[PDB]
């Protein structure tokens, strides 16, 4: 289908830089204007920047002026987004969306996954991933601690397994680091015949960990 | 800057039943305001443009008004898919998300299942031992875990994480993590998760002895 495909997050010291990119596919690229829209964590959707179809108006939300640079390649169809002088504030998903199509109309109903930015000194850590083994309904799971920054995805048979799936929220140890657990309920009677696996993949990190979770 | 301002802050509402929002700009924006759904873990969803138009594929359950300052949305036929934050955008001058308003579906009472995880033996080769207690599909939110160590209430050493409400079945679900030395974990044997919730008749405890089983 349509898509947005953004790119470029990780981990940057306060004062540093990073550059964002948003790759477009299924869609005139060159016909629509694009917005950039960041979530912090515990806040809500704030736009950020936009630049239009042709490029002839250009915005930004004022505690980002002079600091980001919104710009646009149509021949590559991607968007891209130069963040300097990286505040903790700065901190969140950053979406982007089309937002007008030229100057007839706002559209704004093609929204991208988000890529992740961390403002911090702190350095990146793989996680570990250990078995929360079972003992009608049993319970298992896959506990995924010691890592940073956010996020992990965590999955279930590659995706096949979606029912009955629970994956927490992080925690921030005391340590530093983030810890999460996903869980599933399955039938009891299924558990020496069908076999359970969660699929973690921590992206900043370069960590992709398939665990198996048998009975004790 | 243009200030949008939504309110209430948070809504808890039965299914089946009807909620209006309300959003306010600072100043006059016209008609150029839109509505966004964003339930946790997808990519906003825009519901309104134009105040009052619905969106392709938007049905005819949600609804919006207003002009210039003044704006409302009213959701009916509340389901449990519609648990989610509410935003509101002005784009008369580029574009201003007010702080949203996060909708729960008000389900009936549902009593926590709940479980015990002993930590892997993989786990304890690092040198600590996370015990971890599942209290799944309850409603509502509400709920107290305590631990016992060979009967001694533990304090300080337990993180508590709870989900998003489920957009199937409205509940959420909880977990524990007791974190503990491999060697204070093998001075105990008995390892309790304590679980009140307003749907038990008296609180729960799910147990295991260390190298049992
Ligand atoms: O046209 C769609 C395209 O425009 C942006 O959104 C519009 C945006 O305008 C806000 C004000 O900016 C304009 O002022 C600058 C004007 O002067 C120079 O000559 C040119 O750079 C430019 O034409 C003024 O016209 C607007 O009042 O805010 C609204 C967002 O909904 C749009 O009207 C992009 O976001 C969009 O891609």
Redesign the pocket.
Known sequence: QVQLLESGGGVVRPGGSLRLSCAASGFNFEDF?M?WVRQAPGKGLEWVS????NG??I?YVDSVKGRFTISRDNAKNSLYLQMNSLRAEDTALYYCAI??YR?DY?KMDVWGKGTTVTVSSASTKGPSVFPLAPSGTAALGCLVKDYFPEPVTVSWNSGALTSGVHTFPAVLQSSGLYSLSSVVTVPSSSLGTQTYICNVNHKPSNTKVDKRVEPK | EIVMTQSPATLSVSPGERATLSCRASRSIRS?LAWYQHKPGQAPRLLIFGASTRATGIPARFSGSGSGTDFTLTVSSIRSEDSAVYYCQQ?????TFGQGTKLEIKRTVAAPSVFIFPPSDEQLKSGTASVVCLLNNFYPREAKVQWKVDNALQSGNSQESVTEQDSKDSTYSLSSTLTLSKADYEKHKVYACEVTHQGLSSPVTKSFNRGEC
């Open positions: 204007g917005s936009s630049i239009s179809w002839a108006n915005g937002d007008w100057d706002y | 150029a784009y008369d001058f580029w574009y």
